[PDB]
């Protein structure tokens, strides 16, 4: 359910901007039947937004390359070779995640305390 | 003018040649053959630059456009599965022949130095090449949903067909070609989006060109169109139990590249989808079992570098390394394949599972590692065995350093006496034992490939020493002398099951200044002496940075018109000596850093041993004096 | 008030003064001992003929011959050559004269310091390079050494790389300032060089570097 | 049913769709993943 | 549990 | 249901505008750049879709290759969930680093 | 069970469906918002900030309509199909270790790993929310 919250939250703000963008278009026509400088920001905004989506595409592409290049190696070893050994891997992973979390935690705590510092320095 | 405007007659003829399969495949093959240059499979794109200049046509684009439209739309009117497979194979071969004929490094160096350093004369050539080459149109089509849907439909097939099919079946070849096209697209997407789209857009804005877009703006990258398919990874994993070396390597490389990306793992784990997709009908278990059965398969001593089994093993190891190195804090598919219960920010083991019964991928790796002998007689100190064990040790270190998978791994290792097997598998190094039939003191050693095996062996020894030190520290802090006695006995040189082994002081034979890795014989270099390695340089001296400089200097000297023909061989041999000089310097730096890491690991191990030692000191005085004698010359 | 207001009027049309007028102006300024001011006009006329600083991008790349930026350097130099012209009559008029009566500096010595402050403080380093090049041609060695600008270090460093007798000054520059290590650092790096230097000179270099 | 929901969420995650940005992410695991974790 | 992992050469 | 009915009023009205649009056409009867802008914005959606398909297929091949005799197993489960955790941890790390950077600005 | 049945089926479908409907209506909204800037603004006097718009549009359009960038995907696909066939072949070849795989995987450590995973998930969620709060609480100070 908690995961379902964020879903609606996204869907809420989405229909609301689509409500306004679809409203800004009719008021222009309702004005005509009886704002041109405004939609420019909207189009340029969509452009500015997509401009990064393209960069995301590039990123993901580069990743896919970098990944399949690994797949090749995995298969290249798997062909070359041709249970209990991998169980150690899981443990080796988890014991490392513990450490990574414990690493991140420090950063988080540092930030939080770092913010409360300024918060304090504000009314102090 | 086939006997009505040309723009209409051409499309009418294309549509007429689209009805059926025989004529379509024949036309596709004819186009593929025509796209091959006369010199065979880099400039002079294989087609006239004035192709279609008379009529208002974009050149050779209509052909690729029609081919893609056919392959995307008219693939449902083929009832005979064989005809559909043949058509898909022909289309994939056409796409590959179109993509492989694109210059990447040329365009990179052009966009880098042509307009910024070089004149503006050759710029027109590169512009025309980028505008007329169909690579841009192919890349634009790759961002379409129809193409990826057809691809994943072709790759998604029943297993019984591939099992009963022949190795030369058209389905396997088509799947291989599709995987290769996907790999090439994932590799060249960045280069395209960087050095194609802006130039093409600027040209279309400046001049007058009428083109129809066939790409989706929403799909900012190639991963956006494929992240919506969950059965792809399942099919790729199931296709590993077929035995086809090429297909297995291709699938492993594809999975490695997928795991290496970022958007895919951000969409999967923003709970998760892959862990639940691979745990539908026990796919992970069968995948792990197949991988174990594969890695356990022996290799051909004669076909060391040609054994498909060894290639598959190395591919699997590289895949695991890339999957574990990327995002170590958060679990991944590697943890599930090893036999762990991948839970949200937590792992665990299940009762009676494959990893609990010591029958999993990790245990198989441990077995194949402890049952591996590198000490040979005919050659001695092989190279590919060293590489295999180095990859295994890197994977083990990546699994250990991760605190999320550290405690259980250390427990499973200490519960099977892994350090004892490693010590029993150790071998002493001396300046007499050659590496692959080649001696170390030889000058060609620094130029040969034995340096890689030597660095790998040094790293393996360092990792083993670090693991031994960590285990000793753990056993000491656990205040249990049950294992301390065995540890000391192994360090004393005896084993009570007595089997003897060389002590730690015996392995202190890697510090040797007789080779003079720091000193280098500097030739005379009467010419090119002023050419330094400034722009070459993480000590990594690039060779192209000096190659370009020496080429410019040779061109200037030739333009000077002063004994250019005679003194050319001098510059040639000076360059041939400088390249080997750079390679030798790089190898020496690598060996030096490896020796430094090994010495640091040995010092840490010795410190941990001396500090955590409750045993009497009067008996260990002998080892103390031996260590003092050994370090005396090192310090001197 | 007349010369200071004339200077205001000249600097306004700096991006548009003809070399014939600019000369007649500097010629008159020298008659009226207005040394430091005339130097400031020529420096100002320089910057306003080339605001983008192309004579920098020209010399920084190093001698691009057959170039349109030759205009920038050549026009800038007409002003620089006039600065050199002023600095000559400066010493001539106040030739060998002492910089003080007991306690009080001369006004001759004041017009000297006023002039060499405009020169040493300027931000036009293409002017500084052309000025350092001209100081050598006059044998005013000890003048280059005393300059504390950091444009002199770049000039001498860039010239030491291909001229032994200029690397000599850079080493002298450091040793009068007592940056002894930095000098031996050059003397040693110069003896190990690929430059056409006799062995017996390299013996001097290493012998000075050792000291 | 917790871990199940974690799977289910991480399953629906890496599977589309048309959400103007969030494309399915490729899963790694084990070997590549450890290094990918260490490279954090 | 350890059929082959034993140190019995 | 609110979000679902908001996609009913703001649809019927979107259909209602088309009358005033056809009226505007009727008025005018008595551009391509925008039409290029829309297709240009629209074309990349197909690329996203195709890229998604690709990624899905890659996942399929990797998963099936690594294991293909029990796709309902708990290994791929742990793998997936653990990947999720990795990603989330990365997010945490990065964003936290960003906030940490943001504090340096206040250290003036 | 009731809550889960509701969520897992009734709500998920409406969420996804609603999201796609949003996307569709966003397209229609931009289409209308585009035609408005056509028919009414067809007075030939369309300029000013338009240049910047078509400049951006031309830049991104030029970046997209490139041979290499478009080719990379096509190359990638086949480059994937190669590994597809290769992997499927090598898989069919090593399609015998099934009992070893299923039984090898089925264990007990898996149960513990699941637990550790859940714990990690909780810790991770907590950290995430903590950082979220750290952000939300800082953007306040950003104003004061």
Coordinates of C-alpha atoms in Angstrom, one line a residue, chain B residues 39-488:
Chain B
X39 CA 38.2 -4.2 -51.9
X40 CA 36.2 -6.4 -49.5
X41 CA 35.4 -6.1 -45.8
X42 CA 38.6 3.0 -44.2
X43 CA 36.9 5.5 -46.6
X44 CA 35.2 5.6 -50.0
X45 CA 31.7 4.5 -48.8
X46 CA 30.6 1.7 -51.2
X47 CA 28.3 3.7 -53.4
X48 CA 28.6 6.7 -55.8
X49 CA 28.3 10.1 -54.0
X50 CA 26.1 11.3 -57.0
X51 CA 23.6 8.4 -56.5
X52 CA 20.2 10.1 -57.2
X53 CA 21.5 13.6 -57.6
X54 CA 19.4 14.2 -60.7
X55 CA 16.0 13.5 -59.1
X56 CA 15.0 14.9 -55.7
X57 CA 15.9 11.8 -53.7
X58 CA 17.9 11.3 -50.5
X59 CA 20.2 8.9 -52.2
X60 CA 20.3 5.3 -50.9
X61 CA 17.9 6.0 -48.0
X62 CA 14.7 4.8 -49.7
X63 CA 16.1 1.3 -50.0
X64 CA 16.8 1.0 -46.2
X65 CA 13.5 2.7 -45.4
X66 CA 11.6 0.2 -47.5
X67 CA 13.6 -2.7 -46.1
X68 CA 12.8 -1.6 -42.5
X69 CA 9.1 -1.0 -43.3
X70 CA 8.8 -4.5 -44.8
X71 CA 10.6 -6.2 -41.9
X72 CA 8.4 -4.3 -39.4
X73 CA 5.0 -4.6 -41.0
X74 CA 4.8 -7.5 -43.6
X75 CA 6.2 -10.2 -41.3
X76 CA 2.7 -11.5 -40.5
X77 CA 1.8 -12.6 -44.1
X78 CA 4.4 -15.4 -44.0
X79 CA 2.8 -18.7 -42.9
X80 CA 5.8 -21.0 -43.5
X81 CA 8.1 -20.5 -40.4
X82 CA 11.2 -21.3 -42.4
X83 CA 10.5 -18.5 -44.8
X84 CA 10.0 -16.0 -42.0
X85 CA 13.2 -17.2 -40.3
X86 CA 15.1 -16.8 -43.6
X87 CA 13.7 -13.3 -44.2
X88 CA 14.6 -12.2 -40.6
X89 CA 18.1 -13.6 -41.1
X90 CA 18.5 -11.7 -44.4
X91 CA 17.3 -8.5 -42.8
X92 CA 19.7 -8.9 -39.8
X93 CA 22.6 -9.6 -42.2
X94 CA 21.7 -6.5 -44.2
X95 CA 21.6 -4.4 -41.0
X96 CA 25.0 -5.8 -39.9
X97 CA 26.5 -5.1 -43.3
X98 CA 25.2 -1.5 -43.1
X99 CA 26.5 -1.0 -39.6
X100 CA 29.9 -2.5 -39.9
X101 CA 30.6 -0.1 -42.7
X102 CA 30.6 2.9 -40.5
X103 CA 33.8 4.7 -39.3
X104 CA 33.8 5.4 -35.5
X105 CA 37.4 6.5 -34.7
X106 CA 37.6 8.4 -37.9
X107 CA 34.5 10.5 -37.1
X108 CA 35.7 10.9 -33.5
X109 CA 39.1 12.3 -34.6
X110 CA 37.4 14.4 -37.2
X111 CA 35.0 16.1 -34.8
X112 CA 37.9 16.5 -32.4
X113 CA 40.8 17.9 -34.4
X114 CA 39.6 18.6 -38.0
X115 CA 37.8 21.9 -37.5
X116 CA 39.7 22.8 -34.3
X117 CA 43.2 22.1 -35.5
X118 CA 43.2 21.0 -39.2
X119 CA 42.0 23.1 -42.0
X120 CA 38.4 23.3 -43.3
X121 CA 39.1 21.4 -46.5
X122 CA 38.6 17.8 -45.4
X123 CA 35.6 18.9 -43.3
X124 CA 33.4 18.7 -46.4
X125 CA 34.5 15.1 -47.0
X126 CA 33.5 14.0 -43.5
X127 CA 30.3 15.9 -43.7
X128 CA 29.3 14.2 -46.9
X129 CA 30.3 10.8 -45.5
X130 CA 28.1 11.3 -42.4
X131 CA 25.2 12.7 -44.4
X132 CA 25.2 10.0 -47.1
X133 CA 26.0 6.9 -45.0
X134 CA 22.9 5.0 -44.0
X135 CA 24.1 4.5 -40.4
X136 CA 22.1 7.4 -39.2
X137 CA 18.9 6.1 -40.7
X138 CA 19.5 2.6 -39.3
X139 CA 20.1 4.1 -35.8
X140 CA 16.9 6.2 -36.1
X141 CA 14.9 3.1 -37.1
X142 CA 16.4 1.2 -34.1
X143 CA 14.5 3.5 -31.8
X144 CA 11.2 2.3 -33.1
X145 CA 8.9 0.0 -31.2
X146 CA 8.1 -2.2 -34.2
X147 CA 11.7 -3.2 -34.6
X148 CA 12.4 -4.2 -30.9
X149 CA 9.0 -5.9 -30.8
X150 CA 9.9 -8.0 -33.9
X151 CA 13.3 -8.7 -32.4
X152 CA 12.0 -9.9 -29.0
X153 CA 9.3 -12.0 -30.8
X154 CA 12.0 -13.7 -32.9
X155 CA 14.2 -14.3 -29.8
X156 CA 11.2 -15.6 -27.8
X157 CA 10.8 -19.1 -29.0
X158 CA 10.0 -22.5 -27.4
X159 CA 13.0 -24.5 -26.0
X160 CA 12.0 -27.7 -27.7
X161 CA 12.6 -26.2 -31.1
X162 CA 16.2 -25.1 -30.3
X163 CA 16.8 -28.4 -28.6
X164 CA 15.7 -30.6 -31.6
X165 CA 17.1 -28.1 -34.1
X166 CA 20.5 -28.5 -35.7
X167 CA 23.5 -26.3 -34.9
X168 CA 23.3 -24.9 -38.5
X169 CA 19.6 -24.2 -38.1
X170 CA 18.5 -20.8 -39.4
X171 CA 16.8 -19.9 -36.0
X172 CA 20.1 -20.0 -34.1
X173 CA 21.9 -18.0 -36.8
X174 CA 19.1 -15.4 -36.8
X175 CA 19.2 -15.1 -33.0
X176 CA 23.0 -14.7 -33.1
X177 CA 22.7 -12.0 -35.7
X178 CA 20.0 -10.2 -33.7
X179 CA 22.2 -10.3 -30.5
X180 CA 25.1 -9.0 -32.5
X181 CA 23.0 -6.1 -33.9
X182 CA 21.8 -5.3 -30.4
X183 CA 25.4 -5.3 -29.1
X184 CA 26.5 -3.0 -31.9
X185 CA 23.5 -0.7 -31.3
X186 CA 24.3 -0.5 -27.6
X187 CA 27.9 0.3 -28.4
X188 CA 27.2 3.0 -31.1
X189 CA 24.2 4.7 -29.6
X190 CA 26.3 7.2 -27.7
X191 CA 28.5 8.0 -30.7
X192 CA 25.4 8.4 -32.8
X193 CA 23.5 10.6 -30.4
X194 CA 26.7 12.7 -30.0
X195 CA 28.1 13.2 -33.5
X196 CA 25.2 12.4 -35.9
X197 CA 21.9 13.8 -34.7
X198 CA 23.1 17.5 -34.3
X199 CA 24.9 17.5 -37.6
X200 CA 22.0 16.0 -39.4
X201 CA 19.6 18.4 -37.8
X202 CA 21.7 21.4 -38.7
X203 CA 22.0 20.2 -42.3
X204 CA 18.2 19.7 -42.5
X205 CA 17.6 23.2 -41.1
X206 CA 20.1 24.9 -43.4
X207 CA 19.3 23.1 -46.6
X208 CA 16.0 21.8 -47.9
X209 CA 15.4 18.1 -47.1
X210 CA 12.0 16.3 -46.7
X211 CA 12.3 13.3 -44.3
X212 CA 9.8 11.5 -42.2
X213 CA 10.7 10.7 -38.6
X214 CA 10.5 7.1 -37.6
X215 CA 12.0 7.5 -34.1
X216 CA 10.2 7.9 -30.7
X217 CA 11.3 11.1 -28.8
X218 CA 10.2 9.4 -25.6
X219 CA 12.8 6.7 -26.0
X220 CA 15.9 8.8 -25.1
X221 CA 18.0 5.7 -25.3
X222 CA 17.9 2.1 -26.5
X223 CA 17.3 0.8 -23.0
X224 CA 14.0 2.6 -22.7
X225 CA 12.4 0.4 -25.4
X226 CA 13.7 -2.9 -24.0
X227 CA 13.2 -2.3 -20.3
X228 CA 9.5 -3.2 -20.7
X229 CA 10.4 -6.9 -21.6
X230 CA 10.9 -9.2 -18.6
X231 CA 11.1 -12.5 -20.4
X232 CA 14.2 -11.5 -22.3
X233 CA 16.6 -12.2 -19.5
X234 CA 14.7 -15.5 -18.8
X235 CA 15.1 -16.6 -22.4
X236 CA 18.8 -15.6 -22.5
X237 CA 19.4 -17.6 -19.3
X238 CA 17.5 -20.7 -20.6
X239 CA 19.5 -20.6 -23.9
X240 CA 22.7 -21.3 -21.9
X241 CA 21.8 -25.1 -21.7
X242 CA 22.1 -25.6 -25.5
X243 CA 25.9 -26.0 -25.8
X244 CA 26.4 -23.6 -28.7
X245 CA 29.6 -21.7 -27.9
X246 CA 28.9 -18.7 -30.0
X247 CA 25.3 -18.3 -28.8
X248 CA 26.3 -18.8 -25.2
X249 CA 29.0 -16.2 -25.4
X250 CA 26.7 -13.7 -27.1
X251 CA 24.0 -14.2 -24.5
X252 CA 26.6 -13.8 -21.7
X253 CA 27.9 -10.6 -23.2
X254 CA 24.4 -9.3 -23.7
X255 CA 23.5 -10.0 -20.0
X256 CA 26.8 -8.5 -18.9
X257 CA 26.1 -5.3 -20.8
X258 CA 22.5 -5.2 -19.5
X259 CA 23.7 -5.6 -15.9
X260 CA 26.3 -2.9 -16.5
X261 CA 23.7 -0.3 -17.5
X262 CA 22.1 2.1 -15.0
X263 CA 18.6 3.0 -16.3
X264 CA 17.6 -0.7 -16.4
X265 CA 18.6 -1.3 -12.8
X266 CA 17.1 2.0 -11.7
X267 CA 13.7 1.0 -13.3
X268 CA 13.9 -2.6 -11.9
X269 CA 15.0 -1.5 -8.4
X270 CA 13.6 2.1 -8.0
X271 CA 10.5 -3.5 -4.6
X272 CA 12.0 -5.4 -7.6
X273 CA 10.9 -7.2 -10.8
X274 CA 13.9 -9.3 -11.9
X275 CA 14.1 -11.4 -8.7
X276 CA 10.4 -12.3 -8.9
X277 CA 10.6 -12.9 -12.7
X278 CA 13.5 -15.4 -12.3
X279 CA 11.7 -17.1 -9.4
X280 CA 8.5 -18.0 -11.2
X281 CA 9.1 -21.7 -12.0
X282 CA 12.6 -22.2 -10.6
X283 CA 14.5 -20.6 -13.5
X284 CA 17.4 -19.5 -11.3
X285 CA 17.9 -23.0 -9.9
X286 CA 18.2 -24.6 -13.4
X287 CA 20.3 -21.8 -14.6
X288 CA 22.7 -22.2 -11.7
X289 CA 22.8 -26.0 -12.2
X290 CA 23.6 -25.6 -15.9
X291 CA 26.4 -23.1 -15.1
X292 CA 27.8 -25.5 -12.6
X293 CA 27.7 -28.4 -15.0
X294 CA 29.4 -26.2 -17.6
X295 CA 32.2 -24.9 -15.5
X296 CA 32.9 -28.4 -14.3
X297 CA 33.5 -29.6 -17.8
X298 CA 37.2 -30.1 -18.4
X299 CA 39.2 -28.4 -21.1
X300 CA 41.5 -29.5 -24.0
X301 CA 45.2 -29.0 -23.0
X302 CA 46.1 -28.7 -26.7
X303 CA 43.4 -26.1 -27.5
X304 CA 44.2 -23.9 -24.5
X305 CA 43.1 -20.6 -26.0
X306 CA 40.7 -22.2 -28.6
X307 CA 38.7 -24.5 -26.2
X308 CA 35.2 -23.2 -26.3
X309 CA 34.7 -24.5 -22.8
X310 CA 37.4 -22.2 -21.4
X311 CA 35.9 -19.3 -23.4
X312 CA 32.5 -19.9 -21.9
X313 CA 34.1 -20.1 -18.4
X314 CA 35.9 -16.8 -18.9
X315 CA 32.7 -15.2 -20.2
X316 CA 30.7 -16.3 -17.2
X317 CA 33.5 -15.1 -14.9
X318 CA 33.5 -11.7 -16.6
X319 CA 29.7 -11.5 -16.3
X320 CA 29.8 -12.3 -12.6
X321 CA 32.7 -9.8 -12.0
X322 CA 30.8 -7.0 -13.8
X323 CA 27.5 -7.8 -12.0
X324 CA 29.2 -7.8 -8.6
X325 CA 31.3 -4.7 -9.1
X326 CA 28.3 -2.6 -10.2
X327 CA 26.2 -1.6 -7.2
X328 CA 27.7 -3.8 -4.6
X329 CA 25.6 -2.5 -1.7
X330 CA 22.3 -3.5 -3.3
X331 CA 21.9 -7.2 -4.3
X332 CA 21.7 -8.3 -7.9
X333 CA 21.1 -11.3 -10.0
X334 CA 24.6 -12.6 -9.2
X335 CA 23.6 -13.2 -5.6
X336 CA 20.5 -15.2 -6.7
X337 CA 22.6 -17.3 -9.1
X338 CA 25.2 -18.0 -6.4
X339 CA 22.4 -19.6 -4.2
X340 CA 21.4 -16.7 -1.9
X341 CA 17.9 -15.6 -1.0
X342 CA 17.8 -12.0 -2.4
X343 CA 15.6 -10.0 0.0
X344 CA 15.1 -6.3 0.1
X345 CA 18.3 -4.9 1.7
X346 CA 18.9 -8.3 3.2
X347 CA 20.1 -11.8 2.2
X348 CA 19.7 -15.2 3.7
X349 CA 19.9 -19.0 3.2
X350 CA 17.0 -21.4 3.0
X351 CA 16.8 -24.9 4.5
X352 CA 17.7 -27.8 2.2
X353 CA 18.4 -25.3 -0.6
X354 CA 21.1 -25.7 -3.2
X355 CA 23.6 -23.5 -1.2
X356 CA 22.9 -25.2 2.1
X357 CA 23.8 -28.6 0.8
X358 CA 27.1 -27.2 -0.5
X359 CA 25.9 -27.8 -4.1
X360 CA 25.7 -24.4 -5.9
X361 CA 27.7 -22.1 -8.2
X362 CA 29.9 -20.8 -5.4
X363 CA 30.8 -24.3 -4.1
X364 CA 31.4 -25.4 -7.7
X365 CA 33.9 -22.5 -8.1
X366 CA 35.5 -23.4 -4.9
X367 CA 35.9 -27.1 -6.0
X368 CA 37.2 -26.3 -9.5
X369 CA 39.7 -23.9 -7.8
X370 CA 41.0 -26.3 -5.1
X371 CA 41.3 -29.1 -7.7
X372 CA 43.4 -26.9 -10.1
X373 CA 47.1 -27.5 -10.5
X374 CA 49.3 -24.8 -12.2
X375 CA 52.7 -26.5 -11.6
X376 CA 53.5 -28.2 -14.9
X377 CA 56.6 -29.8 -16.2
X378 CA 56.7 -29.5 -20.0
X379 CA 56.1 -25.7 -19.7
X380 CA 55.6 -24.9 -16.1
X381 CA 53.6 -21.9 -14.7
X382 CA 51.0 -21.8 -17.4
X383 CA 49.2 -18.5 -18.3
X384 CA 45.5 -19.3 -18.8
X385 CA 45.3 -21.2 -15.5
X386 CA 46.8 -18.2 -13.8
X387 CA 44.2 -16.0 -15.5
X388 CA 41.4 -18.3 -14.4
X389 CA 42.5 -18.4 -10.8
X390 CA 43.0 -14.6 -10.8
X391 CA 39.5 -14.0 -12.0
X392 CA 38.1 -16.4 -9.4
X393 CA 40.1 -14.6 -6.7
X394 CA 38.8 -11.2 -7.9
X395 CA 35.3 -12.5 -7.7
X396 CA 35.9 -13.9 -4.2
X397 CA 37.4 -10.6 -3.1
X398 CA 34.4 -8.7 -4.5
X399 CA 32.1 -11.0 -2.6
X400 CA 34.1 -10.7 0.6
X401 CA 34.5 -6.9 0.7
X402 CA 30.7 -6.5 0.3
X403 CA 29.5 -6.4 4.0
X404 CA 26.1 -7.6 2.8
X405 CA 27.6 -11.0 1.8
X406 CA 30.7 -11.2 4.0
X407 CA 29.7 -13.0 7.3
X408 CA 28.0 -16.0 5.6
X409 CA 30.8 -16.3 3.0
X410 CA 33.5 -16.3 5.7
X411 CA 31.5 -18.9 7.7
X412 CA 31.1 -21.2 4.7
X413 CA 34.8 -20.8 3.9
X414 CA 36.1 -21.5 7.5
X415 CA 33.7 -24.4 7.6
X416 CA 35.5 -26.2 4.7
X417 CA 39.1 -25.3 5.4
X418 CA 39.6 -23.2 2.3
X419 CA 42.9 -21.6 3.5
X420 CA 44.4 -25.1 3.9
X421 CA 43.5 -26.1 0.3
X422 CA 45.0 -22.8 -0.9
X423 CA 48.2 -23.3 1.0
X424 CA 48.5 -26.9 -0.3
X425 CA 48.0 -25.5 -3.8
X426 CA 50.8 -22.8 -3.3
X427 CA 54.0 -23.1 -5.3
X428 CA 57.4 -21.6 -4.8
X429 CA 58.8 -19.1 -7.3
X430 CA 62.5 -19.0 -8.3
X431 CA 64.5 -17.4 -11.1
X432 CA 65.0 -20.9 -12.7
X433 CA 61.4 -22.0 -13.3
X434 CA 60.5 -20.5 -16.7
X435 CA 57.1 -18.9 -17.5
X436 CA 55.5 -20.7 -20.5
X437 CA 58.9 -22.0 -21.6
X438 CA 60.4 -18.5 -21.4
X439 CA 62.9 -17.3 -18.8
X440 CA 62.4 -14.1 -16.7
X441 CA 65.8 -12.6 -17.2
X442 CA 65.3 -12.5 -20.9
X443 CA 64.8 -9.0 -22.4
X444 CA 61.8 -10.2 -24.3
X445 CA 60.1 -11.0 -21.0
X446 CA 59.0 -7.4 -20.5
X447 CA 57.6 -7.4 -24.1
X448 CA 56.0 -10.9 -23.9
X449 CA 52.7 -11.7 -22.2
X450 CA 54.3 -13.4 -19.2
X451 CA 54.1 -10.0 -17.4
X452 CA 50.3 -10.3 -17.2
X453 CA 50.6 -13.8 -15.6
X454 CA 53.2 -12.6 -13.2
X455 CA 51.1 -9.7 -12.1
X456 CA 48.1 -12.1 -11.7
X457 CA 50.2 -14.4 -9.6
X458 CA 51.4 -11.6 -7.4
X459 CA 47.8 -10.4 -6.9
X460 CA 46.7 -13.9 -6.1
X461 CA 49.5 -14.2 -3.4
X462 CA 48.5 -10.9 -2.0
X463 CA 44.8 -11.8 -1.8
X464 CA 45.7 -15.1 -0.2
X465 CA 47.9 -13.4 2.4
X466 CA 45.1 -10.9 3.1
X467 CA 42.5 -13.6 3.6
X468 CA 44.8 -15.6 5.9
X469 CA 45.4 -12.5 8.0
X470 CA 41.7 -11.7 8.2
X471 CA 40.9 -15.3 9.2
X472 CA 43.7 -15.2 11.8
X473 CA 42.4 -11.9 13.3
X474 CA 38.9 -13.4 13.4
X475 CA 40.0 -16.6 15.1
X476 CA 42.0 -14.5 17.6
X477 CA 39.2 -12.1 18.5
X478 CA 36.9 -15.2 18.8
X479 CA 39.1 -16.4 21.6
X480 CA 39.0 -20.1 20.6
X481 CA 42.3 -22.0 20.4
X482 CA 40.7 -24.9 18.6
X483 CA 41.7 -23.4 15.2
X484 CA 44.7 -21.3 16.4
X485 CA 46.7 -24.5 16.8
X486 CA 46.1 -25.6 13.3
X487 CA 46.8 -22.1 12.0
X488 CA 50.2 -22.1 13.8

